[PDB]
Amino acid sequence: VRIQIWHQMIYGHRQVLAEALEKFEKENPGITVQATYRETEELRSSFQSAAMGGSGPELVYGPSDQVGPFATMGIVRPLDEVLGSDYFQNFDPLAAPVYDGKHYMIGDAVGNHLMLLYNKKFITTPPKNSQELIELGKKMTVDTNGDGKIDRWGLVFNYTEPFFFAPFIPAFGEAFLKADGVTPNLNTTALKDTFQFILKLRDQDKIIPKECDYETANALFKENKAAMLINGDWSWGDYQQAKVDFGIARIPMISETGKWPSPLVGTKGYSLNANMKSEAHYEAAVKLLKYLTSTPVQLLFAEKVGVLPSNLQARESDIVKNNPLLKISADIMEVGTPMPVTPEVRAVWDSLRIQYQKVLAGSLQPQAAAEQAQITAEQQIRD
Numbered sequence: 001v002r003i004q005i006w007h008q009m010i011y012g013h014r015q016v017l018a019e020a021l022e023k024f025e026k027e028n029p030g031i032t033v034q035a036t037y038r039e040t041e042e043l044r045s046s047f048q049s050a051a052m053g054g055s056g057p058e059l060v061y062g063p064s065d066q067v068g069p070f071a072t073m074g075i076v077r078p079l080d081e082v083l084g085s086d087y088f089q090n091f092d093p094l095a096a097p098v099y100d101g102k103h104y105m106i107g108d109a110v111g112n113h114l115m116l117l118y119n120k121k122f123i124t125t126p127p128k129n130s131q132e133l134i135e136l137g138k139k140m141t142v143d144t145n146g147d148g149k150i151d152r153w154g155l156v157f158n159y160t161e162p163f164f165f166a167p168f169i170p171a172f173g174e175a176f177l178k179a180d181g182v183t184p185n186l187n188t189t190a191l192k193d194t195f196q197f198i199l200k201l202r203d204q205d206k207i208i209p210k211e212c213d214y215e216t217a218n219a220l221f222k223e224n225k226a227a228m229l230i231n232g233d234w235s236w237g238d239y240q241q242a243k244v245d246f247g248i249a250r251i252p253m254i255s256e257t258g259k260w261p262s263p264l265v266g267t268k269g270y271s272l273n274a275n276m277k278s279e280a281h282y283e284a285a286v287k288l289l290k291y292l293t294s295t296p297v298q299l300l301f302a303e304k305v306g307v308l309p310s311n312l313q314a315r316e317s318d319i320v321k322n323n324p325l326l327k328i329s330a331d332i333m334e335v336g337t338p339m340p341v342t343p344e345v346r347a348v349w350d351s352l353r354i355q356y357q358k359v360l361a362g363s364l365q366p367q368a369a370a371e372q373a374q375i376t377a378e379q380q381i382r383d
């Protein structure tokens with residue numbers, strides 16, 4: 001039997017997946033696995049389309065907020081009866097977020113959180129607040145030839161993508177989701193102020209590039225052309241392989257409010273397709289799911305890309321205890337908030353991306369964009 005896993009794992013993590021899958025096939029004659037990478041957004045939409053069309057991979061792996069849409073569309077299986085209740089108590093609850101009273105996902109790590117990264121070639125002591133961040137960022141933005149072309153940037157990040165400006169929203173005021181976990185809270189001063197804060201970094205302080213997608217920020221940091229970066233724990237392994245001597249820190253506190261930007265903390269994990277071609281495909285998928293969440297595989301990731309296992313006993317390993325990032329990483333997660341997973345969050349992300357793209361393109365003022373983010377999110381939820 002040949003089964004499939006579709007995932008959104010970055011280079012360093014999918015290298016580890018390949019090693020784990022090679023061992024799985026060696027230990028399970030009769031089962032082979034086809035893995036397919038899709039970027040996070042395309043993974044969600046392509047899994048939804050394939051599974052609604054009656055097909056799709058046996059296993060799908062991605063961020064925990066895909067639980068809401070996948071579960072409400074009936075395209076993934078509840079895992080409680082598959083794995084048993086005693087299974088889930090062995091993991092950090094952040095790795096198995098509950099939705100509608102059931103477990104639809106089990107993650108192999110905990111984190112998925114954004115932070116400040118800094119290149120120790122340039123910075124030894126990271127900024128602790130936004131005023132320091134801007135002052136240092138200006139000193140670290142340099143045009144060697146005085147030709148208007150910037151050679152090194154003070155700060156880079158994928159600031160068009162809503163995940164990357166989400167931490168600032170609660171530091172400027174209200175969270176972007178109300179307490180009920182389903183009502184958008186986007187027509188707020190906090191979102192307007194977040195929009196304006198990043199516009200100021202780009203256009204007034206001029207410490208971030210005018211165009212900076214994920215790969216551009218990634219390359220600039222690897223190439224010693226960005227002193228500071230905002231990125232997630234999924235990126236640690238690839239900067240280590242690229243021989244960047246980096247430190248990590250909280251995204252700096254907003255000076256005007258005294259509040260730490262709050263990263264979303266959660267997991268990326270496995271779900272089982274409601275569609276299974278046969279009993280043999282299902283049994284093989286369950287075997288693979290148990291293997292890829294087993295402590296030997298979690299510690300392989302912990303060893304090679306430096307992330308925190310979801311299994312609680314696995315955290316007693318020397319691999320975890322001796323990782324110099326994990327203590328500061330815990331201090332970063334301490335001011336985070338849990339990733340919401342209800343389907344309403346999907347409407348929030350999609351509305352935020354549409355509106356901030358228009359702001360950054362210069363056609364919509366920040367206040368109007370926050371107002372229309374709320375209206376559009378509510379309409380998408382109604383639909």
Ligand SMILES: OC[C@H]1O[C@H](O[C@H]2[C@H](O)[C@@H](O)[C@@H](O[C@H]3[C@H](O)[C@@H](O)[C@@H](O)O[C@@H]3CO)O[C@@H]2CO)[C@H](O)[C@@H](O)[C@@H]1O
Pocket residue numbers: 008009010013039040041063064065066112161162163164214232234268349
């Ligand atoms: O911006 C809205 C978007 O936010 C969330 O997506 C983030 C993922 O949760 C997060 O893991 C990260 O994705 C990275 C992958 O984990 C990594 O393997 C590699 O592929 O780089 C990715 C970043 O480029 O960042 C994304 C945001 O880009 C949320 O889960 C989404 O549902 C939401 O649409």
Ligand SMILES: [Pt+2]
Pocket residue numbers: 069343346347
């Ligand atoms: Pt939806």
Ligand SMILES: [Pt+2]
Pocket residue numbers: 048052073
């Ligand atoms: Pt659907």
Ligand SMILES: [Pt+2]
Pocket residue numbers: 128129253258
């Ligand atoms: Pt401070």
Ligand SMILES: [Pt+2]
Pocket residue numbers: 265333334336337338
């Ligand atoms: Pt927490």
Ligand SMILES: [Pt+2]
Pocket residue numbers: 069343344346381
């Ligand atoms: Pt929905």
